Write an enzyme that holds these catalytic residues in place. Structure first.
Site, PDB file in Angstrom:
ATOM      1  N   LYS B 195       9.376  -1.335  10.795  1.00 30.59           N
ATOM      2  CA  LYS B 195      10.758  -0.910  10.297  1.00 30.59           C
ATOM      3  C   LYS B 195      10.672   0.597   9.808  1.00 30.59           C
ATOM      4  O   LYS B 195       9.476   0.938   9.677  1.00 30.59           O
ATOM      5  CB  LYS B 195      11.048  -1.836   9.125  1.00 30.59           C
ATOM      6  CG  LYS B 195      11.929  -3.337   9.662  1.00 30.59           C
ATOM      7  CD  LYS B 195      12.438  -4.082   8.779  1.00 30.59           C
ATOM      8  CE  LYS B 195      13.110  -5.411   9.213  1.00 30.59           C
ATOM      9  NZ  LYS B 195      12.372  -6.340   9.762  1.00 30.59           N
ATOM     10  N   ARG B 235       6.667 -11.912  11.149  1.00 23.11           N
ATOM     11  CA  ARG B 235       7.366 -11.546  12.147  1.00 23.11           C
ATOM     12  C   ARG B 235       7.073 -10.091  12.626  1.00 23.11           C
ATOM     13  O   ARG B 235       7.275  -9.250  11.778  1.00 23.11           O
ATOM     14  CB  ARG B 235       8.993 -11.757  12.063  1.00 23.11           C
ATOM     15  CG  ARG B 235       9.810 -11.320  13.057  1.00 23.11           C
ATOM     16  CD  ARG B 235      11.341 -11.599  12.629  1.00 23.11           C
ATOM     17  NE  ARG B 235      12.239 -11.160  13.857  1.00 23.11           N
ATOM     18  CZ  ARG B 235      12.789 -10.227  14.423  1.00 23.11           C
ATOM     19  NH1 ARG B 235      12.369  -9.232  13.727  1.00 23.11           N
ATOM     20  NH2 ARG B 235      13.268  -9.963  15.417  1.00 23.11           N
TER      21      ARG B 235
HETATM   22  N1  LIG Z   1      13.865 -13.465   9.965  1.00 26.71           N
HETATM   23  C1  LIG Z   1      13.874 -11.930  10.050  1.00 26.71           C
HETATM   24  N2  LIG Z   1      14.746 -11.926  11.317  1.00 26.71           N
HETATM   25  C2  LIG Z   1      14.901 -10.619  11.546  1.00 26.71           C
HETATM   26  N3  LIG Z   1      15.535 -10.200  12.827  1.00 26.71           N
HETATM   27  C3  LIG Z   1      15.834  -8.625  13.167  1.00 26.71           C
HETATM   28  C4  LIG Z   1      15.143  -7.904  12.191  1.00 26.71           C
HETATM   29  C5  LIG Z   1      14.998  -6.486  12.741  1.00 26.71           C
HETATM   30  O1  LIG Z   1      13.971  -6.308  13.822  1.00 26.71           O
HETATM   31  P1  LIG Z   1      13.634  -5.427  14.744  1.00 26.71           P
HETATM   32  O2  LIG Z   1      12.682  -4.458  14.170  1.00 26.71           O
HETATM   33  O3  LIG Z   1      13.098  -5.898  16.087  1.00 26.71           O
HETATM   34  O4  LIG Z   1      14.967  -4.535  14.995  1.00 26.71           O
HETATM   35  N4  LIG Z   1      14.431  -8.065  11.390  1.00 26.71           N
HETATM   36  C6  LIG Z   1      14.294  -9.654  10.892  1.00 26.71           C
HETATM   37  C7  LIG Z   1      13.591  -9.735   9.530  1.00 26.71           C
HETATM   38  O5  LIG Z   1      13.083  -9.015   9.007  1.00 26.71           O
HETATM   39  N5  LIG Z   1      13.513 -11.140   9.268  1.00 26.71           N
END
Ligand SMILES: Nc1nc2ncc(COP(=O)(O)O)nc2c(=O)[nH]1
Ligand SMILES: Nc1nc2ncc(COP(=O)(O)O)nc2c(=O)[nH]1
Ligand SMILES: [Mg+2]
Ligand SMILES: [Mg+2]
Lengths: 256, 256
Positions: B195, B235
């Site tokens: 991020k 994740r």
């Molecule tokens: N549960 C959860 N789901 C998510 N889905 C997409 C992104 C953004 O993801 P990316 O970096 O692949 O764009 N972040 C989250 C998250 O922090 N927690």
């Protein structure tokens, strides 16, 4: 604050854990890049003909250089040329002239732990009953030895010597009890970077060890845990990786 | 034990944090590789035309697949095709049909925290007085909402939604207080992987953010710290890196 000591192997070695900068200019370039990446110390290891010129230029570039040697003579040469620390894998045991040199120079001295059963079997792992306790006792005795030579204790740095006549299990045991070594009140340096134990920890499905270059994340994680447990510094090949880890720990731990 | 949820972005997106596997076969290949690397869950995110086929094959390959969607309809389709978890970035707030679907399906539901000031400003960071406390309260309310819909709490997973309408400072604050969220007794999932906050933390001398691909070590370190503080899972984009970190923590922490 945790010191980052970047490794600069000036030898040529087929089995190297991390880059061979035999070539003066590549080596220098590498040292500089490590300082740029955040290493506060560049540990040059080779003998004099190879290391001296690297030590000299780096020191001329304002870098804090450590000489990684078991020989008082190479150390002295290093010092004459700008080095500011002596990193001794023998903990002063290989060279009786080493302590007196350090007492003369008054620069930091790293006493690394490396207790072999015998001189002809330096790499056979020692069968420890209590590695943590034995390592500690050994290091404190090496401190006494240095002190007796006129070295100010304040200049000393302890290093448990991961993987030197030690198994992966011993390694993990030492790290787990890092706080007990830290409690000696003498700064502790951790040198786990890319070592065999990590190759084993991260072995592939097959059972084939993770390649050296693939052991940096693990190394970086060991840096964060070391930071969390009071280590004075970490000796690593991939500076960026360990500096990144340190920044994370500090950002996390300092988040009010 | 910490669950490793590998990210499989099936969208095409110029700004992606981690690989675009729009192509069915690459995507599948990627999912499989992540499971091979140790990911116990593969989070597929896209809409139905793109994700369904990936979800279907992965599920057919025995992989535990999570569907990353805010739409009950896509979720339902995902479930019909083998998915075993719903990852909702809206925490159930975007789709009133979502809770009932989860109550029907009885599979895990990730309630991610994402409180915007307004619908038209989902990305403007919220000015929090006490982000930790607000996030917690919000999540518990979302739990109540889910429960009220017939969902068994045991199936719920909380996620603080790092960087969603949150600053880097908020992010660090949430991580530092991770144990307080963990204390809710509901499993916590951390999604910091690559991020923006990490790009900023690791910005170059110039001030240029670390590239996405260069944020994995930091991500891996966040995985180790998360593990140390009781997180349920992480994740991530680079599975190997986080799995490596986890292995280190376990080896260190378990060293008798
Ligand atoms: N549960 C959860 N789901 C998510 N889905 C997409 C992104 C953004 O993801 P990316 O970096 O692949 O764009 N972040 C989250 C998250 O922090 N927690
Ligand atoms: N102080 C200290 N010095 C060292 N010198 C060389 C190696 C082996 O290093 P390499 O992986 O570059 O061969 N390890 C240490 C160490 O662990 N601690
Ligand atoms: Mg080396
Ligand atoms: Mg992504």
């Amino acid at each position: 604050p945790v010191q980052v000591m970047g490794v600069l192997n000036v030898t040529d070695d087929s089995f190297s854990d991390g880059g061979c900068y035999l070539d003066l200019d590549d080596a220098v370039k590498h040292g500089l890049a490590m300082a740029a990446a955040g290493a506060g110390i560049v540990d040059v290891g080779g003998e004099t003909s190879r290391v001296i010129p690297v030590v000299k230029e780096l020191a001329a570039q304002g870098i804090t250089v450590s000489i990684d040697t078991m020989r008082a003579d190479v150390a002295r040469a290093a010092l004459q040329n700008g080095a500011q620390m002596v990193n001794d894998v023998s903990g002063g045991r290989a060279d009786p002239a080493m302590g007196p040199l350090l007492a003369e120079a008054d620069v930091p001295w790293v006493l690394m732990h490396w207790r072999a059963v015998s001189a002809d079997t330096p790499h056979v792992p020692v069968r420890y009953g209590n590695v943590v306790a034995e390592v500690r006792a050994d290091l404190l005795a090496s401190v006494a030895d240095a002190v007796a030579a006129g070295v100010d204790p304040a200049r000393l740095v302890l290093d448990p010597g991961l993987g030197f006549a030690k198994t992966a299990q011993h390694n993990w045991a030492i790290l787990h009890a890092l706080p007990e070594l830290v409690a000696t009140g003498i700064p502790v340096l951790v040198g786990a970077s890319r070592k065999r134990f990590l190759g084993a920890l991260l072995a592939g499905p097959d059972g084939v060890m993770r390649p050296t270059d693939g052991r940096d994340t693990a190394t970086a994680v060991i840096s964060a845990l070391a930071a969390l447990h009071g280590a004075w510094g970490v000796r690593v090949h991939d500076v960026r990786a360990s500096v990144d880890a340190i920044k994370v720990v500090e950002a996390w731990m300092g988040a009010e």
